[PDB]
Design a protein around this ligand. Structure first.
Ligand SMILES: O=C(O)c1ccc(Nc2nc(-c3ccc4ccccc4c3)cs2)cc1O
Length: 325
């Protein structure tokens, strides 16, 4: 219904801060960048490793499919507002081809290790450390009035040699305003919070905390993704088989949420499972009472009862990380 933290923060700032449709970027010259290799492609972008020929810096250039002017302004304005944020990918420049005017965003380079390889070799401390660092990015963006809305392993770049983490891909991110109805077609299937799956539009920063919880679960249990739905309906079934169906119905009742009747054929009845049920010999060294307590406080149906990024960062699970830092 309303965020527990940072709820009014955008209303307390100048309208210019959040009125991205009115934002006028300064578009530099893309000819300063030499594209070296394609790193990947999205629905509305392609990403390249590049060199800034004026200073020989290695960077990443994200070329935007320019038919989305408002969405471009949104991502640019969000990145500008987040500049300097802890563990948020640094926007170095906003550029256009000086002839075609196709826009592109220039980011700091991170030599990331692919999450499928990485998650197989993480230690207990590593998970604590990387989760803490990711939480710093989420607390920062939430404090800046912004929901990421696409938290997932692919958007969390980790250089495991230098121990650097960056939260990337702000193209689905949005400004939080109390009582605003948001599009539920955000996030990757496996990371969608139950609010999205039940078409509850008055969500908030806590959506990102569900997604973070899914990442935590996948890391400590070594099941990636943790909730592996085959479609958006089955995704909720996978969640309910862990969190329970009675607990789902209590959430829906609290918020007066209408459940699409296609769920009637597929949800079944499921008891809440104990998190200890996911422990076995291959993951036992990554699981502790602290880890399970934290996870249990993240992967809750009720978005208002999930820990905030700060509350999570504050949990005993991270004490070993704080003591080292
Ligand atoms: O969008 C942004 O904010 C953004 C910022 C920095 C950044 N840097 C980097 N990306 C990659 C990478 C590697 C393999 C891939 C496979 C499929 C699809 C994409 C892929 C991206 C490595 S280093 C990428 C970004 O997308």
């Amino acid at each position: 219904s309303r965020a527990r933290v940072y709820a009014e923060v955008n209303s307390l700032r100048s309208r210019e801060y959040w009125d991205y449709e009115a934002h006028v970027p300064s578009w530099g010259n893309q000819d300063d960048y030499q594209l070296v290799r394609k790193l990947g492609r999205g629905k509305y972008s392609e990403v390249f490793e590049a060199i800034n020929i004026t200073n020989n810096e290695r960077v990443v250039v994200k070329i935007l499919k320019p038919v989305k002017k408002k969405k471009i302004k949104r991502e640019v304005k969000i990145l500008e507002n987040l500049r300097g944020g802890t563990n948020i990918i640094k926007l170095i420049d906003t550029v256009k081809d000086p002839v075609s005017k196709t826009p592109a965003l220039v980011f700091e380079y991170i030599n990331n290790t692919d999450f499928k390889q990485l998650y197989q070799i993480l230690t207990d401390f590593d998970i604590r450390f990387y989760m803490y660092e990711l939480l710093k990015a989420l607390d920062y963006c939430h404090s800046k009035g912004i929901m990421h809305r696409d938290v997932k392993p692919h958007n969390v770049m980790i250089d495991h040699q230098q121990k650097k983490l960056r939260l990337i891909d702000w193209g689905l991110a949005e400004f939080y305003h109390p009582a605003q109805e948001y599009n539920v077609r955000v996030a990757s299937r496996y990371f969608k919070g139950p609010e999205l799956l039940v078409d509850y539009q008055m969500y908030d920063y806590s959506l990102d905390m569900w997604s973070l919880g899914c990442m935590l679960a996948s890391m400590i249990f070594r099941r990636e993704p943790f909730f592996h739905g085959q479609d958006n309906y089955d995704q909720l079934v996978r969640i309910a088989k862990v969190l329970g169906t009675e607990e789902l119905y209590g959430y829906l009742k609290k918020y007066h949420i209408d459940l699409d009747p296609h769920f009637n054929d597929i949800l079944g009845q499921h008891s809440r499972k104990r998190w200890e049920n996911f422990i076995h010999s291959e993951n036992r060294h990554l699981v502790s009472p602290e880890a399970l307590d934290l996870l249990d406080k993240l992967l809750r149906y009720d978005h208002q009862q999930r820990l905030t990024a700060k509350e999570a960062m504050e949990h005993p699970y991270f004490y070993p990380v704080v003591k080292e830092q």
